[PDB]
Amino acid sequence: MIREERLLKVLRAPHVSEKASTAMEKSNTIVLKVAKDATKAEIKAAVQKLFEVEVEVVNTLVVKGKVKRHGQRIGRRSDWKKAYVTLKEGQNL
Amino acid sequence: AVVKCKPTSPGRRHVVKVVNPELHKGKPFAPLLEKNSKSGGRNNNGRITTRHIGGGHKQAYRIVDFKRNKDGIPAVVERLEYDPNRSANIALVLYKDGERRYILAPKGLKAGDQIQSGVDAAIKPGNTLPMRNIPVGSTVHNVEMKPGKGGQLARSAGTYVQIVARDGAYVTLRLRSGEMRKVEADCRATLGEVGNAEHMLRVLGKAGAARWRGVRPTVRGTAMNPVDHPHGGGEGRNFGKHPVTPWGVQTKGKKTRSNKRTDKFIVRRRS
Amino acid sequence: MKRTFQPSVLKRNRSHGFRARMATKNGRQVLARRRAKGRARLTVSK
RNA sequence: GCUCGCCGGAAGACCAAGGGUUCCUGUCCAACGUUAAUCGGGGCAGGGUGAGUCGACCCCUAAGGCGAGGCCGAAAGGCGUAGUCGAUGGGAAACAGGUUAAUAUUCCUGUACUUGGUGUUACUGCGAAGGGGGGACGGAGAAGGCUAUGUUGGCCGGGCGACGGUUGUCCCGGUUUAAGCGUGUAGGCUGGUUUUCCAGGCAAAUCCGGAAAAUCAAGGCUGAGGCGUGAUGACGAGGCACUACGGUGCUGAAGCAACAAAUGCCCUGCUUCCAGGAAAAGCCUCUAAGCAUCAGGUAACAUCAAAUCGUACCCCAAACCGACACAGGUGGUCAGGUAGAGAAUACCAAGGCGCUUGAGAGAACUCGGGUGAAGGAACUAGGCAAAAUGGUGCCGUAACUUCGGGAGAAGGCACGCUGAUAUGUAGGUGAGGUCCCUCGCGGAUGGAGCUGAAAUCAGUCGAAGAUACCAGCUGGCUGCAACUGUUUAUUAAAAACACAGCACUGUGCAAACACGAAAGUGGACGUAUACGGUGUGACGCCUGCCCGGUGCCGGAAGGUUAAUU
RNA sequence: AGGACCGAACCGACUAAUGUUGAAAAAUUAGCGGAUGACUUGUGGCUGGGGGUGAAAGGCCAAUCAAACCGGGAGAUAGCU
Ligand SMILES: [Mg+2]
Ligand SMILES: [Mg+2]
Ligand SMILES: [Mg+2]
Ligand SMILES: [Mg+2]
Ligand SMILES: [Mg+2]
Ligand SMILES: [Mg+2]
Ligand SMILES: [Mg+2]
Ligand SMILES: [Mg+2]
Ligand SMILES: [Mg+2]
Ligand SMILES: [Mg+2]
Ligand SMILES: [Mg+2]
Ligand SMILES: [Mg+2]
Ligand SMILES: [Mg+2]
Ligand SMILES: [Mg+2]
Ligand SMILES: [Mg+2]
Ligand SMILES: [Mg+2]
Ligand SMILES: [Mg+2]
Ligand SMILES: [Mg+2]
Ligand SMILES: [Mg+2]
Ligand SMILES: [Mg+2]
Ligand SMILES: [Mg+2]
Ligand SMILES: [Mg+2]
Ligand SMILES: [Mg+2]
Ligand SMILES: [Mg+2]
Ligand SMILES: [Mg+2]
Ligand SMILES: [Mg+2]
Ligand SMILES: [Mg+2]
Ligand SMILES: [Mg+2]
Ligand SMILES: [Mg+2]
Ligand SMILES: [Mg+2]
Ligand SMILES: [Mg+2]
Ligand SMILES: [Mg+2]
Ligand SMILES: [Mg+2]
Ligand SMILES: [Mg+2]
Ligand SMILES: [Mg+2]
Ligand SMILES: [Mg+2]
Ligand SMILES: [Mg+2]
Ligand SMILES: [Mg+2]
Ligand SMILES: [Mg+2]
Ligand SMILES: [Mg+2]
Ligand SMILES: [Mg+2]
Ligand SMILES: [Mg+2]
Ligand SMILES: [Mg+2]
Ligand SMILES: [Mg+2]
Ligand SMILES: [Mg+2]
Ligand SMILES: [Mg+2]
Ligand SMILES: [Mg+2]
Ligand SMILES: [Mg+2]
Ligand SMILES: [Mg+2]
Ligand SMILES: [Mg+2]
Ligand SMILES: [Mg+2]
Ligand SMILES: [Mg+2]
Ligand SMILES: [Mg+2]
Ligand SMILES: [Mg+2]
Ligand SMILES: [Mg+2]
Ligand SMILES: [Mg+2]
Ligand SMILES: [Mg+2]
Ligand SMILES: [Mg+2]
């Protein structure tokens, strides 16, 4: 039983974009920004308990941060985790 | 069974092969097999310490019974087999109690023959006895040096040892080298000679044949520079010096044995 | 033609990596020298 | 956009390594791009990488590494046992269709499969660090049976032709379907079963190994492909409608056969040879300590779980190694048509490109090529370079020889197209039909249809029929080296090195010898028919004299002679 | 059968021309040798500088080799320019 605090930690932000929106309309999938060390089970439990929604499967990928340049200085953005989590055709979050 | 190849190609013209139809054409007895990877003449420091070793065919090691300490139980020769690890052929024997072992195949030992080891075994080729129990003048092979240690003398193809005399707890033996050596009379010996005596009649025929056996080429010292051999140097072919090893030791007639511990067991040197 | 540097991450890590340096006192002297100089990158590991 | 040209065993597609956002979209043209640039692998901003089944991770080990104690060493350290790591190798499981600007075996649809944990039912002897089996293994060679794939016919849809002809023996296109499950086939291997005993497998074993009985005569395992199902589905030419002109949506015929056929599969097979061809685990089986109306195992069902990391993009290259957007280097897989022996070669398909300065002119000279009167090596150090030869079939072929060769010696003849033999032959493949049985993926016969060389005779066109690309120059005397190999990466490929063979010599095993102050290790899990060193260098005929000098081997009467006393 | 024969891939490097501030700090083009073996190639591993490795050219040991490279003794010494 994953604790309340861990569940409250593992969710960070929704992922807003064209592909995420299309997943929402078509496959009933919401796309999330989650913690880097958050596992599929933790994401599922947190989504179920805080969004009050029923979940069937969680797909995860890690995004590699981009190396950009700020005034001749090298600088890199952080890696992050993105979750494709599918809702079971009755909740419409 | 010594047969020469027809000269269909320059590398076949001089080849002479020894082929035994008596040998087993199938796979060896698996439970008596072990792996032995190759060294290439390199020691545990990784340095070359014996030259001219490398490459060659993969070989599996056959566990061979050099002790023959399973006295009392008879055995039958099941077949003869090719052994890549040695010149001599090996024989698979089945003991009547159900155990199988490899032994060096002596001259004349064929499938179906019986063998036995012990103090009370008959004097016939293949049987092992203490030399205390073997008549003086018997041709033996696979001779122990220390009791219970296993055969160490006369193991190559075609070799044997002559039991010359027996006085005290010691027997005088004549070795293949011509040396006369005293060994303790409790040391076991197998009657007869080692088989495959035609092994020395083979002609390799080509350089690749020596390469298949894991021998790498030998470079004459006189053909290199003085920095890396005592024989090196010269404008054209020159020698002008006494022949030595790559390490400077005279290599035509200088004796190198120095073992005072075993000097007492040598009756006469090979000369 | 075939030049001298043929990259391989595994071989590079095993030859010059942090674990390899730490495995001998001479390698630890290399690390001590590079820390004393102030190197931003001690080894090829990162 | 329409023409043109180039690659197509790549200049196409996909893995691994390596790189790391170069991927996609919007915007910008300062600097970068060998020119311009509206363009870019450039700048700036956003987006994009979805797995129980792919890989890593993980279980198991090779070479090798590290290494508790240990052995050794001024110190630092070296080596190594029990162990523990280490893939380039062994070990469970997923396919087809569809979808984005950029991911897909990961997403959706449909159909599957593996492993484990829990609950129950029924039955029951379970239990390992141990035993046994298995995993588990080389080169070459040969068929046979298949498939990928191709071509042709049939079928379906469309067409009737810019210029003579084209309702046909005509033109164009399509004719696709998996894993899984069921079947156990061409073929490969092995004789089974129930008894009684036993110096073996460290003890035990009912398992393996050995000894004997009786009985039985067919049991067992393995295995491509095919067929049925999967699939009344999906895909499908084209057609109807828009289009923001990028594309979107609906509908949807035929969807069969014959023949040819791999270097892929059966095949970790079979035949054969000598140079004699990993390990460990998973897996199966056997018991010991020990638990024993419990545990624990087997089978059926229910349920839950299969985490984490990688997944964009280049990848024979403008993204990797070469300072460059550099004519260089870079392991594996895929493998269409015509001709062809072919993965050569020429032209093409799918697909991908015109190589990031152009425009004129038509001097010398330079580079890369074509042709050349008469002569034909006169050139030159030297035929350097060029020119020439070049295929298949048949005929024919010398000295010499180690009897294999020399040899493709040399030299010569035929070669296209059409018809007949023969409406398409020899041969190959083979449907029906009939017959039979231990009934099926069975045998005998039968031969329709399909495919199909080569030869002969006769005609026929050209200067020329191996017409292009492709593709030996040949012969004579002689030095050296026997030969195949190797070498001065980057001026030397050779007569130099090596070699099989020969000889001398050392070495009795704790071998000699080598690497190590040592412990150890190699030699070698070898044992004188073996191992090291040295010289010579296939083979043939052979290898003469000198031991004064130097070295090495043996001897110790005498002389001299150290530490020591 | 074969360190057998012709010939692609693949490995090499005999001749010539070009190039020589190169397209390239060793290549290109046309020819050339081997091409089932003493063959070739991937991945990983071992051998360390008076040392290794070497079918032996003083070859090679990261475009460096009759003694690698880096740091130190070090401002070696220089009757020489
Ligand atoms: Mg899923
Ligand atoms: Mg993932
Ligand atoms: Mg030797
Ligand atoms: Mg020799
Ligand atoms: Mg020389
Ligand atoms: Mg010297
Ligand atoms: Mg001379
Ligand atoms: Mg002289
Ligand atoms: Mg073309
Ligand atoms: Mg960028
Ligand atoms: Mg782009
Ligand atoms: Mg510009
Ligand atoms: Mg860009
Ligand atoms: Mg210790
Ligand atoms: Mg160690
Ligand atoms: Mg180990
Ligand atoms: Mg391990
Ligand atoms: Mg691996
Ligand atoms: Mg893509
Ligand atoms: Mg077919
Ligand atoms: Mg092949
Ligand atoms: Mg991709
Ligand atoms: Mg360069
Ligand atoms: Mg360019
Ligand atoms: Mg390039
Ligand atoms: Mg290559
Ligand atoms: Mg081609
Ligand atoms: Mg001109
Ligand atoms: Mg010209
Ligand atoms: Mg010309
Ligand atoms: Mg003309
Ligand atoms: Mg002329
Ligand atoms: Mg003329
Ligand atoms: Mg003439
Ligand atoms: Mg002349
Ligand atoms: Mg002249
Ligand atoms: Mg002249
Ligand atoms: Mg020429
Ligand atoms: Mg020419
Ligand atoms: Mg004809
Ligand atoms: Mg002359
Ligand atoms: Mg030669
Ligand atoms: Mg040659
Ligand atoms: Mg050179
Ligand atoms: Mg050269
Ligand atoms: Mg030893
Ligand atoms: Mg010589
Ligand atoms: Mg000679
Ligand atoms: Mg050959
Ligand atoms: Mg040849
Ligand atoms: Mg070379
Ligand atoms: Mg070339
Ligand atoms: Mg060839
Ligand atoms: Mg160099
Ligand atoms: Mg020096
Ligand atoms: Mg000083
Ligand atoms: Mg100075
Ligand atoms: Mg002076």
UniProtKB/Swiss-Prot annotation, chain A:
Q: Does the keyword Ribonucleoprotein apply?
A: yes
Outcome of residue 18 to A? Binds normally to ribosomes; strongly reduces trigger factor binding
Q: SUPFAM superfamilies this protein is in? A: Ribosomal proteins S24e, L23 and L15e
Annotated GO biological process = cytoplasmic translation; ribosomal large subunit assembly
Q: Which UniProt keywords apply?
A: Ribonucleoprotein, Ribosomal protein, RNA-binding, rRNA-binding
MF annotations from Gene Ontology: rRNA binding; structural constituent of ribosome
Tell me what the record says results from residue 52 to K: No effect on trigger factor binding
Which cellular components does GO assign to this protein? cytoplasm; cytosolic large ribosomal subunit
Cross-referenced HAMAP family, in alphabetical order? Ribosomal_uL23_B
For this chain, the family text in UniProt reads:
Belongs to the universal ribosomal protein uL23 family.
Q: What does this protein do?
A: One of the early assembly proteins, it binds 23S rRNA; is essential for growth. One of the proteins that surround the polypeptide exit tunnel on the outside of the subunit. Acts as the docking site for trigger factor for Ffh binding to the ribosome (SRP54) and to nascent polypeptide chains.
Quaternary structure and interacting proteins, as annotated: Part of the 50S ribosomal subunit. Contacts protein L29 and trigger factor. Might also contact SecE and probably does contact SecG and SecY when the SecYEG translocation complex is docked with the ribosome.
Q: What's the name of the protein?
A: Large ribosomal subunit protein uL23
UniProt source species: Escherichia coli (strain K12)
Swiss-Prot record, chain B:
Query: Which molecular-function annotations from GO does this UniProt entry contain?
Result: RNA binding; rRNA binding; structural constituent of ribosome; transferase activity; zinc ion binding
Give GO cellular component annotations, separated by semicolons: cytoplasm; cytosol; cytosolic large ribosomal subunit; DnaA-L2 complex
Q: N6-acetyllysine: which positions carry it?
A: 241
**InterPro entries tied to this protein:** NA-bd_OB-fold, Rib_uL2_dom2, Ribosomal_uL2, Ribosomal_uL2_bac/org-type, Ribosomal_uL2_C, Ribosomal_uL2_CS, Ribosomal_uL2_dom3, Ribosomal_uL2_RNA-bd_dom
Asked if the Swiss-Prot or TrEMBL record annotates the protein with the keyword ATP-binding, the reply is: no
Q: What keywords are annotated for this sequence in UniProt?
A: Acetylation, Ribonucleoprotein, Ribosomal protein, RNA-binding, rRNA-binding
Q: Does the keyword Electron transport apply?
A: no
Q: Compositional bias (Low complexity) spans?
A: 38-47
- Region (Disordered): which ranges? 27-52, 220-271
Q: Which family does it belong to?
A: Belongs to the universal ribosomal protein uL2 family.
HAMAP family in alphabetical order: Ribosomal_uL2_B
* Remarks, miscellaneous: This protein can be partially replaced in vivo by its H.marismortui (HmaL2) or human (L8, from the 60S cytoplasmic ribosome) homolog.
Its name, as the record gives it, is: Large ribosomal subunit protein uL2
Q: Which organism is it from?
A: Escherichia coli (strain K12)
- The gene that this protein is the product of is rplB
Curated annotation (Swiss-Prot), chain C:
Q: Does the keyword Ribonucleoprotein apply?
A: yes
Protein's UniProt name: Large ribosomal subunit protein bL34
What organism does the UniProt record list as the source? Escherichia coli (strain K12)
Q: Could you give a GO molecular-function term held by this entry?
A: structural constituent of ribosome
Q: In the UniProt record, which is one GO cellular component term?
A: cytosolic large ribosomal subunit
Tell me the protein family, please. Belongs to the bacterial ribosomal protein bL34 family.
Subunit record text:
Part of the 50S ribosomal subunit.
Q: Which GO terms describe its biological process?
A: cytoplasmic translation
> Which keywords annotate this record?
Ribonucleoprotein, Ribosomal protein
